[PDB]
């Protein structure tokens, strides 16, 4: 239960961090931050409610934490304005970096991969 | 045109008619299917609690029902049994069909594509640690 794809508090913690460390970095106007941080909210909220009710697992958790992430890239690749696709893309990867060190002290590279990948294939689409 | 994404009711009919179709088609075992549907409700509780703010737009619904049909995608391509990786692909698609269907009217293909490529993708990956 040391990671936030298995403690809730942790993938809370996560997705706060995620947005924290994105709001010093370049890329995203006013609005867009406004957006990534409203659905941050709606996700940090909706895992403590589930929490509570011991309604998480780490399929679950998992799951959801792969929704936030795939948001965050959905909003990057299809709001237009604030800087480029590839500036855009680095501060998700940057942000999440963070996250990660913020939490668990241990970089998952290969999701961050995933989440830069998936930029470009909400981008193309 | 008329999405899901177009305003908070059809963001939530949306869901829940990708969940009850779903719920009819192979390939999911009963426990991924309850996973689905947590989450779906889950993310329906906070599309209402978002509109009763004001707060919703089409920018963040189009956020927010991407972040529905990921995690779909994801506990698909994740949770072992139940049937094929083809097959659990094919349901989701035909689920999402389905859902635009019985809530806008128009099934929007090239988003189906996505969440299908996203099965296909996230069964590559996994989610480790």
Known sequence: ???PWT?????????NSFMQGLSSMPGFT????DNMSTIAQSMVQSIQSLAAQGRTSPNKLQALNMAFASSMAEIAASEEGGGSLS?????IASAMSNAFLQTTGVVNQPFINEI???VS???QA
């Open 1 to 3: 239960h040391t990671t």
């Open 7 to 15: 403690n809730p508090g942790l993938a809370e913690n996560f997705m």
């Open 30 to 33: 006013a609005s867009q931050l």
């Open 87 to 91: 500036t855009k893309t680095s501060s």
């Open 116 to 118: 830069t990948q998936l």
């Open 121 to 123: 294939m909400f981008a």
